[PDB]
Design a protein around this ligand. Structure first.
Ligand SMILES: [Mg+2]
Ligand SMILES: [Mg+2]
Ligand SMILES: [Mg+2]
Ligand SMILES: [Mg+2]
Ligand SMILES: [Mg+2]
Ligand SMILES: [Mg+2]
Ligand SMILES: [Mg+2]
Ligand SMILES: [Mg+2]
Ligand SMILES: [Mg+2]
Ligand SMILES: [Mg+2]
Ligand SMILES: [Mg+2]
Ligand SMILES: [Mg+2]
Ligand SMILES: [Mg+2]
Ligand SMILES: [Mg+2]
Ligand SMILES: [Mg+2]
Ligand SMILES: [Mg+2]
Ligand SMILES: [Mg+2]
Ligand SMILES: [Mg+2]
Ligand SMILES: [Mg+2]
Ligand SMILES: [Mg+2]
Ligand SMILES: [Mg+2]
Ligand SMILES: [Mg+2]
Ligand SMILES: [Mg+2]
Ligand SMILES: [Mg+2]
Ligand SMILES: [Mg+2]
Ligand SMILES: [Mg+2]
Ligand SMILES: [Mg+2]
Ligand SMILES: [Mg+2]
Ligand SMILES: [Mg+2]
Ligand SMILES: [Mg+2]
Ligand SMILES: [Mg+2]
Ligand SMILES: [Mg+2]
Ligand SMILES: [Mg+2]
Ligand SMILES: [Mg+2]
Ligand SMILES: [Mg+2]
Ligand SMILES: [Mg+2]
Ligand SMILES: [Mg+2]
Ligand SMILES: [Mg+2]
Ligand SMILES: [Mg+2]
Ligand SMILES: [Mg+2]
Ligand SMILES: [Mg+2]
Ligand SMILES: [Mg+2]
Ligand SMILES: [Mg+2]
Ligand SMILES: [Mg+2]
Ligand SMILES: [Mg+2]
Ligand SMILES: [Mg+2]
Ligand SMILES: [Mg+2]
Ligand SMILES: [Mg+2]
Ligand SMILES: [Mg+2]
Ligand SMILES: [Mg+2]
Ligand SMILES: [Mg+2]
Ligand SMILES: [Mg+2]
Ligand SMILES: [Mg+2]
Ligand SMILES: [Mg+2]
Ligand SMILES: [Mg+2]
Ligand SMILES: [Mg+2]
Ligand SMILES: [Mg+2]
Ligand SMILES: [Mg+2]
Ligand SMILES: [Mg+2]
Ligand SMILES: [Mg+2]
Ligand SMILES: [Mg+2]
Ligand SMILES: [Mg+2]
Ligand SMILES: [Mg+2]
Ligand SMILES: [Mg+2]
Ligand SMILES: [Mg+2]
Ligand SMILES: [Mg+2]
Ligand SMILES: [Mg+2]
Ligand SMILES: [Mg+2]
Ligand SMILES: [Mg+2]
Ligand SMILES: [Mg+2]
Ligand SMILES: [Mg+2]
Ligand SMILES: [Mg+2]
Ligand SMILES: [Mg+2]
Ligand SMILES: [Mg+2]
Ligand SMILES: [Mg+2]
Ligand SMILES: [Mg+2]
Ligand SMILES: [Mg+2]
Ligand SMILES: [Mg+2]
Ligand SMILES: [Mg+2]
Ligand SMILES: [Mg+2]
Ligand SMILES: [Mg+2]
Ligand SMILES: [Mg+2]
Ligand SMILES: [Mg+2]
Ligand SMILES: [Mg+2]
Ligand SMILES: [Mg+2]
Ligand SMILES: [Mg+2]
Ligand SMILES: [Mg+2]
Ligand SMILES: [Mg+2]
Ligand SMILES: [Mg+2]
Ligand SMILES: [Mg+2]
Ligand SMILES: [Mg+2]
Ligand SMILES: [Mg+2]
Ligand SMILES: [Mg+2]
Ligand SMILES: [Mg+2]
Ligand SMILES: [Mg+2]
Ligand SMILES: [Mg+2]
Ligand SMILES: [Mg+2]
Ligand SMILES: [Mg+2]
Ligand SMILES: [Mg+2]
Ligand SMILES: [Mg+2]
Ligand SMILES: [Mg+2]
Ligand SMILES: [Mg+2]
Ligand SMILES: [Mg+2]
Ligand SMILES: [Mg+2]
Ligand SMILES: [Mg+2]
Ligand SMILES: [Mg+2]
Ligand SMILES: [Mg+2]
Ligand SMILES: [Mg+2]
Ligand SMILES: [Mg+2]
Ligand SMILES: [Mg+2]
Ligand SMILES: [Mg+2]
Ligand SMILES: [Mg+2]
Ligand SMILES: [Mg+2]
Ligand SMILES: [Mg+2]
Ligand SMILES: [Mg+2]
Ligand SMILES: [Mg+2]
Ligand SMILES: [Mg+2]
Ligand SMILES: [Mg+2]
Ligand SMILES: [Mg+2]
Ligand SMILES: [Mg+2]
Ligand SMILES: [Mg+2]
Ligand SMILES: [Mg+2]
Ligand SMILES: [Mg+2]
Ligand SMILES: [Mg+2]
Ligand SMILES: [Mg+2]
Ligand SMILES: [Mg+2]
Ligand SMILES: [Mg+2]
Ligand SMILES: [Mg+2]
Ligand SMILES: [Mg+2]
Ligand SMILES: [Mg+2]
Ligand SMILES: [Mg+2]
Ligand SMILES: [Mg+2]
Ligand SMILES: [Mg+2]
Ligand SMILES: [Mg+2]
Ligand SMILES: [Mg+2]
Ligand SMILES: [Mg+2]
Ligand SMILES: [Mg+2]
Ligand SMILES: [Mg+2]
Ligand SMILES: [Mg+2]
Ligand SMILES: [Mg+2]
Ligand SMILES: [Mg+2]
Ligand SMILES: [Mg+2]
Ligand SMILES: [Mg+2]
Ligand SMILES: [Mg+2]
Ligand SMILES: [Mg+2]
Ligand SMILES: [Mg+2]
Ligand SMILES: [Mg+2]
Ligand SMILES: [Mg+2]
Ligand SMILES: [Mg+2]
Ligand SMILES: [Mg+2]
Ligand SMILES: [Mg+2]
Ligand SMILES: [Mg+2]
Ligand SMILES: [Mg+2]
Ligand SMILES: [Zn+2]
Length: 63
RNA sequence: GUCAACCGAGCGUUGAUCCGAGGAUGUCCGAAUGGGGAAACCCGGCACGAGUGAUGUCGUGUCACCAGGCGCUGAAUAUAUAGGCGUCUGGGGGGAACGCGGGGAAGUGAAACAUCUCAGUACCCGUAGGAAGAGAAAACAAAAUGUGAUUCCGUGAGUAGUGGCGAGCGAAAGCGGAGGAUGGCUAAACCGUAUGCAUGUGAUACCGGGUAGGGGUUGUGUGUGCGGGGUUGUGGGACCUAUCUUUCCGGCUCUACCUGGCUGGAGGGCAGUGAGAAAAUGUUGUGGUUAGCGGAAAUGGCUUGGGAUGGCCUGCCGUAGACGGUGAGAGCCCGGUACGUGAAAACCCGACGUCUGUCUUGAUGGUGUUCCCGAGUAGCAGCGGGCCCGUGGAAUCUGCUGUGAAUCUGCCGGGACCACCCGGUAAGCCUGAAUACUUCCCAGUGACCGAUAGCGGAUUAGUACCGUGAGGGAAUGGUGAAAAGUACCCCG
RNA sequence: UUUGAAGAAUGAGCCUGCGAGUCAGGGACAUGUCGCGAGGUUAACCCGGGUGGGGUAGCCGCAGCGAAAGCGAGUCUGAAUAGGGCGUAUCCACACAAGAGUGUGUGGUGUAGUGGUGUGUUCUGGACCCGAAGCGGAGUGAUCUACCCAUGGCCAGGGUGAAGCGCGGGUAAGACCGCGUGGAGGCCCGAACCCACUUAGGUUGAAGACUGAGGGGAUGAGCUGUGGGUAGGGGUGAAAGGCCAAU
RNA sequence: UGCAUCCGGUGAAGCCGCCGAGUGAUCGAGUGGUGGAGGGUGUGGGAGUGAGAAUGCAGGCAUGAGUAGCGAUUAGGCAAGUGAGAACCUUGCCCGCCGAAAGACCAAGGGUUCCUGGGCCAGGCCAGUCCGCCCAGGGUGAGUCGGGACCUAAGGCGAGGCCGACAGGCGUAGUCGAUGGACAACGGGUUGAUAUUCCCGUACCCGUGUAUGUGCGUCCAUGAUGAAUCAGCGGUACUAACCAUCCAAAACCACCGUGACCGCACCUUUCGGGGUGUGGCGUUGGUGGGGCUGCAUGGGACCUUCGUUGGUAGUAGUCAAGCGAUGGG
RNA sequence: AUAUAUCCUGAGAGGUGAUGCAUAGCCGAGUGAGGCGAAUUCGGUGAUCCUAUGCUGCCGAGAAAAGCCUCUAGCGAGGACAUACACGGCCCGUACCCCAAACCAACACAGGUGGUCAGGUAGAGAAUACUAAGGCGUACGAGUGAACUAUGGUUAAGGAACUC
RNA sequence: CAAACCAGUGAGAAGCGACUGUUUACUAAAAACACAGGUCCGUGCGAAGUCGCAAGACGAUGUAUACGGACUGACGCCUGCCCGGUGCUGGAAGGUUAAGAGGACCCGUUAACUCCCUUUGGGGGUGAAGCGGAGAAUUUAAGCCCCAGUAAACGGCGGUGGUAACUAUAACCAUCCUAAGGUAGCGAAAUUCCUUGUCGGGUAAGUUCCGACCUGCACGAAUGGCGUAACGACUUCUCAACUGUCUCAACCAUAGACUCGGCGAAAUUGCACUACGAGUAAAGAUGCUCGUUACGCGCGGCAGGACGAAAAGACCCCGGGACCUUCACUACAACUUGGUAUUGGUGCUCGAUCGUAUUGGGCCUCUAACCUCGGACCGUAUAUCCGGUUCAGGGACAGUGCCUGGUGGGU
RNA sequence: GUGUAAGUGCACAAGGGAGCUUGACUGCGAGACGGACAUGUCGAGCAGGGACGAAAGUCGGGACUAGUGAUCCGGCACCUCU
């Protein structure tokens, strides 16, 4: 819940809301997961904290 | 140097001290950086010298972490990588405010109270700078054939608006001003090179007239890397086809001989320490700063007077009658005042001949047909945030999650939203001046205080003292003009 | 302060100093007063080591009515002369009506606001002065106490006598019992130590919690030195709303 | 503050009196005494502008008052000395009190309170020659005691690492961290103060080195062994069989029950269905007899698998001494 | 091999240490130092001190690491073992107080503060009573038969009738 | 003749608690706390539950004969009946409902037009495709509603009337209603208001005590009932000794109080040449009226007044705080669902334009995303952290985000 | 006796019946009453249309006095408002 490696997406802070509409401070943390992505076409794969936005950005590739 | 005096030793006409510029010296703790640690203290490794009969012993240096590179090494293992070393360059902490940015509340008002307000305030945190930040419209405007980056002022106006439509909050457009730089580029529609991965009909296919010699720019798809030149506002650029064309040379579009498309070298540019090319090449103002020099004119006389600058009388000078001191009110007494002058050396602000780059293989004006200019971006569904705007009919901005575009008969804006037309190029980038602040220094000023005031602090003050801590936190000025601070005698 | 105080209602030991309606805003209004007058005035800003000059950007009134279109000395209402609401500053003289008080038409008197300066009030600012219980953010504390963690130390003396053990009884083996040994025990009495039950004194005390007589445990859930960790809406808590540095 | 400018060392402001005047807040070019350096008419201007109170604040001084108290449970008297003064100090005599302390050593802590010398304002709840007062001087002596050179617990810090909006939080290798473990000291004497430190006498254990006497190799060579090499075997028992033991796949013989068929006699509704007894099969429920061949279960042997040597190659490469760990016990 | 075999551990006792020292006292010498200097044996009691980190017995089952000894991985042509030898071992604390007028309590305060030493007579004793060593009478005193208060002693007879 | 110091009062009846023990430092040491005994429930091991926005650590280097939570509290006899309410536990067939998808209606705009007017589309309505606005129905999980269980889970266990051989009764039947309507035991008790209930014991006298009766206002069986040996600085009561606690105080030795010398305080304080009584009055007067009495001043004592001093009254009320409780409001932490993403494939089975079509649901597989706290290597000379490699197990689950619904005095 | 309590009124009816029918109108409103204020009450006359009565005239709710709710936010219809 810290940071996504490439997108640079630090979690943002905002306030929730009731139906009565009374505020309270809360947070949002980007959807971060690690995968053993492919780096070089030689087969070397490594792990990097990536979010869904980055994944669908598809800098990381699959076989 | 001072308290503080005092002595005692002493230093000077050759110029000692005093002030300024550069330099060296700088124990230890303290980012502390050789390891450790209860700060000012313990314990080592490595390289060079020295002394002892040698050791003992001594000095000197170097020895942190992280970041970024370079060279060497390489584990699982085969390549290679992590890791491992060693070396250069940076940063590390502190500082009053200001600025940016990440986060961010309640007391309070609403006469209660949740929305709301208090307010993005205090406070915490990470950054740089002397300013920062913002900054060249994807802005406004509204038919005028208008504005023309940002920033800061005074308006516009407590108006339009927002709000349990309450308390409250609060624009924009336009106008007048300060300051100005309409300011130049990178990277995708061709090519030369360092290139590789792939393959050969390995010859009739590759060079821009004619003769001749010579022997995979992949066939097909996709992605990545390297570039001249294409970056709209009347709507705009190129795989090919109609016109003038202000130097030369070579090599290319897989070869050699007209037409077409590029790159390299000899010459007018574009400018350059720059936000749009990078690194280097060096210096003149009586400019200032750091300290300094000169700088006028009454012993004038008398009176009170302890003491005169005072009262009276003369004469005084002034480009200087700000100021302070000297025995009471001083321009004619001293420090000094206007004015003039001045730096061996160093430093901040202003030009000028070594030396450097580029380009004139590039540039300017003229007639028609056919893969580029910011993508996970604009916009979208949900969720929230900032714009006066609290979902309200809600644009514009940002963003968390899922989604997701066109590229010129493209986009987005014009305050739900649509059509004709109206106006300006988003997703890349930087860039002075106007502005804010003052821990620090200088010079001046005050209808500012004059010791319970004024900074807590005119004095050994952030001390004594209190608290183990964070922290709190005092009271305490004047003898005299000068110490001439009471010799000596007497009581005790 | 009170309806009301000589008050036995509050405050004042005394003296001296210090101590309380201030201050800002083209803020708003009214009253004084000052200049000009259908006009009044400028902000910011530029240039005079000096308050000058420039600067009309802007604001208020000269016209109001209507929510608005819009109209305009009228306008709104309304289907409307058909009067009413609001203004036409305000009045004088002439005529027309009813004399529903006044309205409707003519000729003159012709409209007074604005910017200082000082003042009361309101305005937002802490807004006449001192004063709270408390909420929130950042930090400082476990040198007492609570708990716990590691390492050490402490518990004079004197009794009680489990299991177990051996022998003798007893079994067929037992089991069971007498005898001597053994000495367990949150066992007993009682010093150090640690506590706090009663009384007394003290309660401007020797002491911000004690002194003296007695008072319980006193080999353990014990106590004690040592050094460490647990931080505030949290700790800890053999639980009382206790302790967390006399709070 | 502005001003015509003045008042004053022939005495300003301030302080304390006196006089006179205004209805008031006051005033007086109104003065007497202290004071010895600045005030200021008038007319405006601006204010931190007027104190008795707020259990106000700070300072000073009141009263209760010369009152309460002088801080234990042990307690003194006296002689003589110093001194101005002597219950309180010094010396002496007796008395009393503690004596698991009210004595003697340390740690923690404090830091000069230790000793000597001088004086007694201030401090000691009184005086005070005395003091833990002040003033000056002196005083702290370690290879062997203690803290670092050593090692570690609880726990803290922490490269890299992991996680975290920032800050930071964790925890590995490591490094810190005593209240523990590790190495050596005794008695006497000494000054006014130090002592297991100084002196005396006698010992010790750790760290470096000496070089010889023991005396030991590597650079000679003797000892114990030790193990990485060519030729086959485990009656067990690969492959046609024999003796003995229980079982049955291609149903012969015999009976019986009858999926279903052909029917022979009787019963039954008038005849029907149907039941009973039986005959021929068929079985709702396919072996025995015999040989060729091929495979499956044990026997001896044929060629390749041994009873580790026959030369060699104790010819040559190896050292243990002496110290050798970030490792093991 | 069951051997008091062997090894390890081990307070204590004897000897040397020590013909030394100290010593009660003797002499001259006074604020007090100096020289000389006798005996220096026995038994018996006896610890909470030491053997002991031991022995027995119990469950609640009672640190780590180092130093030391020892074994080897990586070397090697000079180390091992003693001793005459004169050499060589840091820095810092070391005074004083330390159940107190010196520390923590604002004081020269009837409080608290951890470890060590533990005499004699009675006694079980580390209680208690009196004493040595040694240190104190802890800083207001002098005088007065009052109340009254506090600390105490004694009390005719009655014995809880006071009083919750 | 234990002569000193030192050195247990004892016994009886009972209440509560098993006891040793701990606690409200600095007013409460108990009957409270705590425990040893049991009970219920949760907890399958990267556990349950904790601290922590995370890694991670405790739990534990433990493993259901362990750990956590809650209740009662040795031991013995026991621990009755009630599942409507609230909870918890199982069952989701039905009804209601999330987000998310979605596209019928309705609405806006505009090319063409549509009457007539000119000549080179608007003024008297339709509505083009897209654009958009509100906008559908349709798919939806948990939960709630619903069905059962559960009381050592929180909790309840009645009233009404009638009904005997003299006498008061109910020991039997009928009423309502809820789920049932208090069983054993004990009971004017630590609960009993009348109440000092009545009776008996103890005393002359007993509102306390003990022992019984039961009219239990308003006991009661794990927020446990009844007894209980021992224990207790616990509660009540009685008895013998005991005594100055008392009848009823007396004397005496001590340190103060007193006088003398020395040093030298504090609270309070508008004034002060400060009497009495009756009256008056802001309603109890040293200070007013009236009358009485009284030379000025001290010292020791005693406390009735000076509404005496100390603390801006606790109680009460009035404008406000903090903490706490809960089915008060509004939320939020945590727990829980689905969709969506980290996201892959085959086979089957189910639908709206029995032989032609509808793309998603449910299942079984598999590796390859992902997890692994399994193993074994390496970084390493030492490393249980960590990173990489291999294999092994899982595996498209899980976890994680975002939206959403539940629950939510934990905050 | 007079719709719903009491008072005030009411026979000239405000009491019944019938006929007819909508004035329980539209826009104003001279002036008043009460109101601290927001509000609340009464009312002759003027313009269109209608109702009853031939006409005269009466008709702007019930014999009167109770039967009620501010502001915001929102919903719905019409207009020669933007
Ligand atoms: Mg991150
Ligand atoms: Mg924010
Ligand atoms: Mg908020
Ligand atoms: Mg996708
Ligand atoms: Mg210099
Ligand atoms: Mg130097
Ligand atoms: Mg360091
Ligand atoms: Mg460093
Ligand atoms: Mg590098
Ligand atoms: Mg490789
Ligand atoms: Mg409010
Ligand atoms: Mg309020
Ligand atoms: Mg607020
Ligand atoms: Mg705001
Ligand atoms: Mg700079
Ligand atoms: Mg800029
Ligand atoms: Mg404006
Ligand atoms: Mg307001
Ligand atoms: Mg180009
Ligand atoms: Mg180009
Ligand atoms: Mg155009
Ligand atoms: Mg000069
Ligand atoms: Mg003179
Ligand atoms: Mg001058
Ligand atoms: Mg002068
Ligand atoms: Mg001068
Ligand atoms: Mg809004
Ligand atoms: Mg909008
Ligand atoms: Mg463009
Ligand atoms: Mg500027
Ligand atoms: Mg402090
Ligand atoms: Mg009054
Ligand atoms: Mg009065
Ligand atoms: Mg009085
Ligand atoms: Mg009063
Ligand atoms: Mg009072
Ligand atoms: Mg009052
Ligand atoms: Mg008072
Ligand atoms: Mg104003
Ligand atoms: Mg005028
Ligand atoms: Mg001007
Ligand atoms: Mg209007
Ligand atoms: Mg109208
Ligand atoms: Mg003014
Ligand atoms: Mg706070
Ligand atoms: Mg701490
Ligand atoms: Mg037994
Ligand atoms: Mg025994
Ligand atoms: Mg006893
Ligand atoms: Mg006393
Ligand atoms: Mg205190
Ligand atoms: Mg007694
Ligand atoms: Mg115990
Ligand atoms: Mg802390
Ligand atoms: Mg709290
Ligand atoms: Mg309690
Ligand atoms: Mg309580
Ligand atoms: Mg406390
Ligand atoms: Mg004079
Ligand atoms: Mg004079
Ligand atoms: Mg004078
Ligand atoms: Mg003056
Ligand atoms: Mg003036
Ligand atoms: Mg004042
Ligand atoms: Mg005063
Ligand atoms: Mg007053
Ligand atoms: Mg006062
Ligand atoms: Mg007094
Ligand atoms: Mg007295
Ligand atoms: Mg006295
Ligand atoms: Mg005392
Ligand atoms: Mg004397
Ligand atoms: Mg004694
Ligand atoms: Mg003792
Ligand atoms: Mg003793
Ligand atoms: Mg200490
Ligand atoms: Mg002296
Ligand atoms: Mg003196
Ligand atoms: Mg004194
Ligand atoms: Mg001194
Ligand atoms: Mg690190
Ligand atoms: Mg760490
Ligand atoms: Mg660690
Ligand atoms: Mg260490
Ligand atoms: Mg240590
Ligand atoms: Mg010493
Ligand atoms: Mg010593
Ligand atoms: Mg040595
Ligand atoms: Mg030292
Ligand atoms: Mg010493
Ligand atoms: Mg000492
Ligand atoms: Mg002592
Ligand atoms: Mg003190
Ligand atoms: Mg004392
Ligand atoms: Mg004390
Ligand atoms: Mg103690
Ligand atoms: Mg003892
Ligand atoms: Mg004695
Ligand atoms: Mg003694
Ligand atoms: Mg007394
Ligand atoms: Mg007697
Ligand atoms: Mg008696
Ligand atoms: Mg009982
Ligand atoms: Mg008890
Ligand atoms: Mg007990
Ligand atoms: Mg207890
Ligand atoms: Mg207690
Ligand atoms: Mg206490
Ligand atoms: Mg208490
Ligand atoms: Mg108590
Ligand atoms: Mg208990
Ligand atoms: Mg039980
Ligand atoms: Mg239980
Ligand atoms: Mg249970
Ligand atoms: Mg778990
Ligand atoms: Mg209980
Ligand atoms: Mg049931
Ligand atoms: Mg129920
Ligand atoms: Mg549809
Ligand atoms: Mg439910
Ligand atoms: Mg009873
Ligand atoms: Mg009972
Ligand atoms: Mg009772
Ligand atoms: Mg009773
Ligand atoms: Mg009774
Ligand atoms: Mg009684
Ligand atoms: Mg009862
Ligand atoms: Mg009850
Ligand atoms: Mg039960
Ligand atoms: Mg129960
Ligand atoms: Mg209960
Ligand atoms: Mg019970
Ligand atoms: Mg019992
Ligand atoms: Mg008696
Ligand atoms: Mg008496
Ligand atoms: Mg007395
Ligand atoms: Mg006395
Ligand atoms: Mg005195
Ligand atoms: Mg009176
Ligand atoms: Mg009276
Ligand atoms: Mg009186
Ligand atoms: Mg009082
Ligand atoms: Mg109060
Ligand atoms: Mg209140
Ligand atoms: Mg609170
Ligand atoms: Mg989903
Ligand atoms: Mg999926
Ligand atoms: Mg609450
Ligand atoms: Mg009628
Ligand atoms: Mg009118
Ligand atoms: Mg009506
Ligand atoms: Mg009517
Ligand atoms: Mg509203
Ligand atoms: Zn990302």
């Amino acid at each position: 819940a810290a940071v996504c490696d490439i997108c640079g997406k630090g979690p943002g802070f905002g306030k929730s809301v009731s139906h009565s509409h009374r505020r309270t401070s809360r947070r949002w943390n980007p959807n971060i997961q690690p995968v053993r992505a492919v780096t070089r076409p030689g087969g070397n794969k490594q792990r990097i904290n990536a979010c869904t936005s980055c994944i669908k950005a598809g800098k990381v590739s699959r076989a």
